Amino acid sequence: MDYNLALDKAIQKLHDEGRYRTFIDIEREKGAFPKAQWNRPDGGKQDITVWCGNDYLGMGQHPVVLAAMHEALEAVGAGSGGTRNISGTTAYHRRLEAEIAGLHQKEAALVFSSAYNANDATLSTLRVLFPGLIIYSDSLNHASMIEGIKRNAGPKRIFRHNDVAHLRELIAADDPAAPKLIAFESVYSMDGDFGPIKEICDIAEEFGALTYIDEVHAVGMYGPRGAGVAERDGLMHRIDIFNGTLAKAYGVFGGYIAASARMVDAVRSYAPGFIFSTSLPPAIAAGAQASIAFLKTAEGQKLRDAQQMHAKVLKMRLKALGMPIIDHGSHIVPVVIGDPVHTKAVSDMLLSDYGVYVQPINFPTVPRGTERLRFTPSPVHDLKQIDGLVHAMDLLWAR
Amino acid sequence: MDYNLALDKAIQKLHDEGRYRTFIDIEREKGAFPKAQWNRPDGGKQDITVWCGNDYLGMGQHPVVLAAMHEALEAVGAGSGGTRNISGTTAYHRRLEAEIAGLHQKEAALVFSSAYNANDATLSTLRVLFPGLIIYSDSLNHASMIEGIKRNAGPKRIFRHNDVAHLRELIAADDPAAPKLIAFESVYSMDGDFGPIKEICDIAEEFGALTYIDEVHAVGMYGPRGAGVAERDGLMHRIDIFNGTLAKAYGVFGGYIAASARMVDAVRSYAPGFIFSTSLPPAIAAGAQASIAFLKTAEGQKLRDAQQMHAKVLKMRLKALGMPIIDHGSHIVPVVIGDPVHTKAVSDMLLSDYGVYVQPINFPTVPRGTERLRFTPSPVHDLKQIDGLVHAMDLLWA
Ligand SMILES: CC(C)(COP(=O)(O)OP(=O)(O)OC[C@H]1O[C@@H](n2cnc3c(N)ncnc32)[C@H](O)[C@@H]1OP(=O)(O)O)[C@@H](O)C(=O)NCCC(=O)NCCSC(=O)CCC(=O)O
Ligand SMILES: CC(C)(COP(=O)(O)OP(=O)(O)OC[C@H]1O[C@@H](n2cnc3c(N)ncnc32)[C@H](O)[C@@H]1OP(=O)(O)O)[C@@H](O)C(=O)NCCC(=O)NCCSC(=O)CCC(=O)O
Ligand SMILES: Cc1ncc(COP(=O)(O)O)c(C=O)c1O
Ligand SMILES: *Cc1c(COP(=O)(O)O)cnc(C)c1O
């Protein structure tokens, strides 16, 4: 039994499918987002523009976020030094959980070291709290959701993406006494489309199911207080559990769930993924809390307005260059190439020729045959930045 | 169903077993560790001494760690803004990974958002890279290891804690052509005992198995450079994969594995837990890197010598007092109470009556019937401090 052989086989398999990923070493320039320094593999340094990042509103450089972080470092040190149970519970975590509960108008919130962990731990743990739980999952749910859903044995049903008629057909066929939970996303990361929240909620109420929504690509960005798409549509009260991140629009790190005190307490008491891990550094919690708080204000709205419009302008200018990109009406702008090697070929050209950094997206992040570039215009991608990008794209494609 | 009823039943169940956990809201005072402010449930504030923390060497307040963190915040901002693939790979992560690789004298290292995630992702992904892998796991392995080992379907064998005779018996009975991996800890968090690294490595070599060691409660603290117990015993070259944390003795946050470039690249390319999650904030990576680098030096050794001795003194003083204290020769000092409700009472009294904070440890962190207090003396727990605690436990006790 030669372990190295097997490793080589597994690696070679990636190259043969043209999906081996090469990371890009960068350093974002605080105060000058979206500018970053690219550390080229040949040791050189090049100024670049980040066009595919997930700090959607540039909160990673916001002076109020950084002030809160610098203060916390000075007050309590670098980390918490423990799990939530063994000394790692700080006022910074309580405040942050209250801030999140308030955002989603829920009794409680629970903070994990990432939205990934939150989804994985919570979905799996619910199978333990609700013996016989059947989980209905949107075919394009995120990996973390799929992972949580499968982790522990138990019934799952996958419904065709956004297909509520399929959802209802599946659920009506199931044992009417079984606990049921429907898990889906408000904004899907790669297509940039919206989940039909009202219709799913309607189905959940009709069949007595819990609803679980991942608003990871929505929080900070939609709704008058940045609480997400359900807030935008006035449906937050119809959602049982919210899952969110503090690492994207909020610009820091970590994730959470928000739900009733009963739900939060059960999860925190039973989920190994919550119990057995060091709690988030107080400075992270400080920064994230400041971010959420800020984005709840009229000043936050300004950032959302600017993002919406920059996205709208970019899409307009790209279609005008004779470029069909499917515009599902969100802030995410995907350009589908449809082959992983072309996708990297094109991404290499933007990077080197133009300083436009947009990572090539392939399997398993997107289905095979749907590989793409994924632009994420933020408030800091000003009108001239946009014009810069379109002229790059035009000049590129004129090859 | 009625979902609220089931939740109540699940919560009531905790109370009935006397294991419902009440968290303690604290704020450590940077520059004055182990002092912290306890935010009492009644709104009051009280000065306390942390005695159960995992920032084992007080690196959480170290000026070089904090300097690097402040610097990074100013250079690149609050977070990375992406997954490792989508813009989240920074020079700070590369440097950190190299720093860790060097620590364990391995070709490569891979950083996850926690040692938990590292264990869970790696152990499960290994089943995918080595079809038919049989994993042999110490009965007292950490939850994260257990979670990783069972995540994907596949053979597992649990050996009685530290029992190498049992390990060998199990492994000799299995198909001799199957890929095998043995997974164990160098220091077990709750007993404070040591894994028999040499004997396990010997078995591994004899039966052609990979060795996977979790040194989470050892890195920064054992070996001349703080690389752990395998470094201490000159066994680092016989270990295939190391798992470690940046959140305990290193004083920051996050975890990692260290192994060959091949091993790291395979895991990185196949593990959903690595792929689909935002990368560690550059400031966290900056701080951790500074921490490891510092603890590699003679000045780091000073902190280890101080910790070892404070631990030695505390155990001596507690035996002297007649406490029920298990001593397996590590820096962890467990006092077994053996009942989750009395463990809470003793702990509650200690806090509100004497400003001593030592969380009651119950199931599922430790087996039922073995609930306990777990003292973690650090270099900042000076001789006066120790004197303070012993006097308090004596007065208790009564
Ligand atoms: C290949 C597929 C399409 C599904 O087939 P697999 O390759 O997993 O085959 P397999 O693992 O043997 O089969 C999948 C197992 O998981 C289950 N499964 C598959 N899809 C599911 C869904 N939507 N909901 C619930 N369960 C699902 C199957 O029933 C099966 O479980 P059983 O066998 O037990 O029945 C999946 O891997 C995938 O495409 N995932 C996409 C992940 C995603 O959406 N990522 C968003 C990226 S956003 C991001 O963070 C970017 C990241 C980056 O690149 O940096
Ligand atoms: C009593 C135990 C040992 C667990 O007893 P359980 O009854 O839960 O075990 P179980 O029901 O058998 O668990 C179910 C599945 O897990 C498997 N399983 C159990 N132990 C295993 C091991 N060592 N390796 C691999 N698999 C294992 C079983 O085979 C089983 O599958 P089958 O039954 O189908 O065979 C307790 O000590 C525990 O689980 N502790 C968690 C790990 C730990 O030591 N954590 C301390 C971390 S210190 C920390 O992080 C601090 C934290 C804090 O408190 O905040
Ligand atoms: C829908 C969804 N949920 C969760 C995650 C992971 O979030 P986090 O960075 O907080 O681990 C991703 C982001 O990559 C995602 O696309
Ligand atoms: C606490 C613990 C972990 C988790 O480490 P984090 O970095 O805090 O996730 C992993 N292994 C062991 C043995 C632990 O005690």
- Please state, as a whole number, how many other Cβ atoms lie within 10 Å of the Cβ of residue B390: 17
Cα separation, A81 vs B246, whole angstroms: 10
Rounded to 10 degrees, what is the CA torsion of A339, A343, A346, A352?
A: -150
Helices A282-295 and A91-104 cross at an angle (nearest 10°) of 30
Helix (H, G, I), strand (E, B) or coil at A233: coil
What one-character-per-residue DSSP string does A239-296 give?
Answer: -SEEEEESSSTT-S--EEEEE-HHHHHHHHHH-HHHHTSBPPPHHHHHHHHHHHHHHT
**Most ligand 1 atoms within 8 A of CB, residue of A21, A23, A150 to mutate:** A150
Cα separation, B357 vs B347, whole angstroms: 7
User: b vs e for B102-134, b when ≥16 Cβ sit within 10 Å of the residue's Cβ?
Assistant: bbbebebbbbbbbbbbbbbbbbbbbbebbeebb
CB A21 within 8 A of CB A33: no
Comparing CA positions, the residue from B94, B137, B161, B121 lying closest to residue B243 is B121
Output the ligand 3 site: residues, CB below 6 A: A 114-116, 142, 144, 185, 189, 214, 216-217, 245, 247, 255; B 83, 276-278
Residue A36's region, left for phi above 0, alpha for psi from -120 to 50, else beta, is: beta
Q: How far is the CA of B247 from the centre of ligand 1 (A)?
A: 31
Peptide bond into B34 cis (omega under 30): yes
CB A110 within 8 A of CB A97: yes
Which residues 6+ apart lie within 8 Å of A142 measured at CB? A119, A185, A189, A214, A216, B276
Cα separation, B216 vs B169, whole angstroms: 28
Cα separation, B170 vs B161, whole angstroms: 13
User: b vs e for B270-297, b when ≥16 Cβ sit within 10 Å of the residue's Cβ?
Assistant: bbbbbbbbbbbbbbbbbbbbbbbbbbbe
Q: Show the CA angle centred on residue A163, arms to residues A159 and A168, nearest 5°.
A: 70
What one-character-per-residue DSSP string does A198-221 give?
Answer: HHHHHHHHHHT-EEEEE-TTTTTT
CB B288 within 8 A of CB B68: no
CA–CA min distance B383, chain A (Å): 22
The secondary structure of residue B106, as a DSSP letter, is -
Secondary element (H or E) of residue B171:
helix B164-173
- Please state, as a whole number, how many other Cβ atoms lie within 10 Å of the Cβ of residue A199: 14
**Most ligand 2 atoms within 8 A of CB, residue of B146, B336, B344, B363 to mutate:** B146
Q: Show the CA angle centred on residue B29, arms to residues B27 and B35, nearest 5°.
A: 90
Helix (H, G, I), strand (E, B) or coil at A304: helix
Cα separation, B274 vs A147, whole angstroms: 13
Residues in chain B, total: 398
CB contact under 8 A, B277 and A144: yes
Contacts with A54 from chain B: Cβ below 8 Å: 81-83, 86-87, 278
What one-character-per-residue DSSP string does A32-58 give?
Answer: STTEEEEE-TTS-EEEEEE-S-S-TT-
Cα separation, A90 vs A85, whole angstroms: 11
CB B115 within 8 A of CB A51: no
Which of B38, B46, B74, B76 has the highest number of chain A CBs within 10 A, making it the mutation to test binding with A? B76
Residue type at B179 in one-letter notation: P
Q: Nearest 5°: phi and psi at B181? A: -140, 135
Residue A325's alpha-carbon distances to A188, A222, A316, A332, in angstroms, are 16, 22, 10, 11
Cα separation, B145 vs A10, whole angstroms: 23
Cα separation, B284 vs B290, whole angstroms: 10
Both ends of chain A: CA-CA distance in Å? 50
Q: Show the CA angle centred on residue B252, arms to residues B250 and B256, nearest 5°.
A: 70
Cα separation, B193 vs B181, whole angstroms: 22
Chain B residue closest in CA terms to A148: B151
Helices A164-172 and A197-207 cross at an angle (nearest 10°) of 10
CA–CA min distance A165, chain B (Å): 23
Residue type at B76 in one-letter notation: V
Helix (H, G, I), strand (E, B) or coil at A59: helix
Resolution in A: 2.8
Helix (H, G, I), strand (E, B) or coil at B147: helix
Q: Which ligand is nearest to the CA of B149?
A: 2
Query: Catalytic annotation on B248?
Result: yes
Residues in chain A, total: 399
Shortest-distance Cα residue to atom 16 of ligand 3: A189
Cα separation, B353 vs B346, whole angstroms: 10
Both ends of chain B: CA-CA distance in Å? 50
Secondary element (H or E) of residue A359:
none
Cα separation, A251 vs B80, whole angstroms: 8
Residue located via tokens 């929080």: A219
Record the tokens describing residue A68, joined without a space.
């809160």
CB A394 within 8 A of CB A385: no
Q: How far is the CA of A182 from the centre of ligand 1 (A)?
A: 17
Give the determination technique: X-ray
Comparing CA positions, the residue from B57, B222, A203, A153 lying closest to residue B242 is B222
CB contact under 8 A, A59 and B78: yes
**Most ligand 2 atoms within 8 A of CB, residue of B140, B248, B365 to mutate:** B365
The secondary structure of residue A352, as a DSSP letter, is I
What one-character-per-residue DSSP string does A142-192 give?
Answer: -HHHHHHHHHS---EEEEPTT-HHHHHHHHHTS-TTS-EEEEEESB-TTT-
Cα separation, B295 vs B379, whole angstroms: 13
Is A55 within 8 Å of chain B by CB?
yes
CB contact under 8 A, B78 and A10: no
Q: Which ligand is nearest to the CA of B88?
A: 1
CB B211 within 8 A of CB B242: no
Positive or negative: CA dihedral B165, B170, B173, B175: negative
Helix (H, G, I), strand (E, B) or coil at A387: helix
Is B32 within 8 Å of chain A by CB?
no
Residue located via tokens 């899907």: A188
Chain B residue closest in CA terms to A288: B78
Q: For each of the domains in chain B, give its residue range(s) and CATH number, in order of start.
A: 1-62+299-398 (3.90.1150.10), 63-298 (3.40.640.10)
